[PDB]
Ligand binder design. Structure first.
Ligand SMILES: *[B]([O])([O])[C][N]C(=O)/C(=N\OC([C])([C])C([O])=O)C1=[C]SC([N])=N1
Length: 263
């Protein structure tokens, strides 16, 4: 039970020196393609989709929540804050925080989403509420990116994340307006052109959230609207043996290319 596609992904992984995890859902026929689909990987910033979605869910019963100001203080800045540092000693709304977290991967923005949900466990609780029994968020930014091999903290599986991303962006885990907002945010991501998108035909529309961390952890989760067919959901996770390993977005592109060529 090893397909040509899975054999190619194994070949790619071997040449990469690291560990690769892939999960595809083709929503035309609901079929799946997985590679290490039930192994755990550090999420790094791909976890920001779950936090933003959790806040969107809260906004379904609070029409003004996304307009609520949140104070940003100097002490709130962490390792990567390109948007929040512009608002120090001021405020950002929860919408602005969601956009910054998703489209620029601002880590201070993520921490405010996590706080709005009552801590990392509030993010996990939302995951469980929408059927994901695998996701776990245990820490805030920036320590949730330590990505230590064998550490279960702040991990999920490719299979679980693909399923959840489908429910969030194409399914009914969120209200219609909230689903549309999440899709809009993902489609406007600034960080993804070298990752999954780089492996797919350019005519296709992609909405994604990247992740980066220690152990050269390089991730991307995407919803894809190909030319001429139903949407796809694709998760590509990659992590390496050495703590100081360099980013390998090319490996994610290569995985996406193999998946696309298998359609
Ligand atoms: B998320 O995974 O996109 C947040 N990423 C990080 O905090 C890390 N790097 O982010 C920048 C600075 C944008 C990058 O160079 O990829 C990070 C945390 S630990 C590590 N080695 N890099």
């Amino acid at each position: 039970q090893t397909s040509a596609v899975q054999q190619k992904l194994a070949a790619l992984e071997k040449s990469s020196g690291g560990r690769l995890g892939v999960a595809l859902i083709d929503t035309a026929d609901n079929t799946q393609v997985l590679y290490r689909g039930d192994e755990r990987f550090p999420m790094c910033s791909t976890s920001k989709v779950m936090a933003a979605a959790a806040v969107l869910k809260q906004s379904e019963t609070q029409k003004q929540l996304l307009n609520q100001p949140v104070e940003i203080k100097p002490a709130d800045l962490v390792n990567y804050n390109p948007i929040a540092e512009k608002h120090v000693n001021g405020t950002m709304t929860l919408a602005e925080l969601s956009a910054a977290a998703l489209q620029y991967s601002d880590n201070t923005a993520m921490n405010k989403l996590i706080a709005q949900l009552g801590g990392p466990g509030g993010v996990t609780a939302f995951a469980r509420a929408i059927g994901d029994e695998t996701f776990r968020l245990d820490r805030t930014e920036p320590t949730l990116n330590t990505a230590i091999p064998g550490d279960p903290r702040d991990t999920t599986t490719p299979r679980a994340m693909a399923q959840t991303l489908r429910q969030l962006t194409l399914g009914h885990a969120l209200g219609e307006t909230q689903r549309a907002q999440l899709v809009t945010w993902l489609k406007g991501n600034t960080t993804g052109a070298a990752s999954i998108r780089a492996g797919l035909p350019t005519s296709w529309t992609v909405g994604d959230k990247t992740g980066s961390g220690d152990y050269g952890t390089t991730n991307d989760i995407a919803v894809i609207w190909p030319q001429g067919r139903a949407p796809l959901v694709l998760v590509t996770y990659f992590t390496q043996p050495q703590q100081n390993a360099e980013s390998r977005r090319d490996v994610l592109a290569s995985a996406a290319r193999i998946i696309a060529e298998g359609l």
